[PDB]
């Protein structure tokens, strides 16, 4: 990738456009991320139209001789508007 | 999935924990999503430690007789803490 935006740079860009303090913006982002993780961890899906949806998937146990038990996965599905934006 | 949280429910949960109005919380979320899409569309990666990173990938042209030209993809890579949370 060209550049790497970290959380502080994301907070600074967003704060500039909302007018909110960097402190409030940052707590709001941190809580948004916690709520999404909590919800998906419970087996729910979070849909953000124009961005995408977070959700979980299932992995069955699989052998490779080692053994891997079943797990859940973190799934992100980008929405049309995100994919279209990245293709321009 | 069990339940589906939409943007208004995500805003209501977050607003409750920050104290911010639902209006401010919602504009902050909308701007965060726009900034992430803009950044990835430029070829940058956004890293949110404890959640994950957004980025793009490349798809080369491929034949299947139909023809599909090269595209860019939307990539989300969940961080350790998200995966561990979903596996509990």
């Amino acid at each position: 990738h060209h550049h790497h935006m970290n959380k502080q740079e994301l907070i600074d860009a967003v704060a500039a456009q909302t007018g909110a303090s960097k402190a409030q913006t940052g707590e709001t982002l941190d809580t948004l991320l916690e709520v999404i993780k909590k919800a998906v961890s419970k087996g729910d899906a979070v849909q953000l139209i124009g961005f995408g949806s977070f959700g979980s998937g299932k992995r069955a146990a699989r052998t490779g001789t080692i053994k891997i038990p079943a797990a859940k996965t973190v799934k992100f599905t980008a929405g049309k508007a995100f994919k279209d934006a990245v293709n321009k």
Side-chain angles (χ1 to χ4, degrees), chain A residues 7-23 25-37 39-61 63-64 66 68-72:
Chain A
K7 196 189 287 180
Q8 185 52 46
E9 302 166 344
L10 179 58
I11 293 167
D12 294 355
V14 171
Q17 294 178 229
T18 70
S21 78
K22 305 192 200 178
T25 298
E27 201 192 38
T28 292
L29 178 66
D30 287 353
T31 310
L32 279 153
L33 300 180
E34 285 302 307
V35 172
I36 297 170
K37 290 190 292 173
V40 171
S41 291
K42 305 186 291 120
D44 294 9
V46 189
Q47 192 181 34
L48 305 168
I49 290 132
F51 189 83
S53 49
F54 297 89
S56 52
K58 296 190 71 180
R59 216 185 60 212
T63 310
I66 71 174
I68 320 162
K72 301 167 195 160

Side-chain angles (χ1 to χ4, degrees), chain A residues 80-87:
Chain A
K80 178 174 192 298
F82 202 165
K83 292 189 284 218
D84 282 340
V86 170
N87 279 273

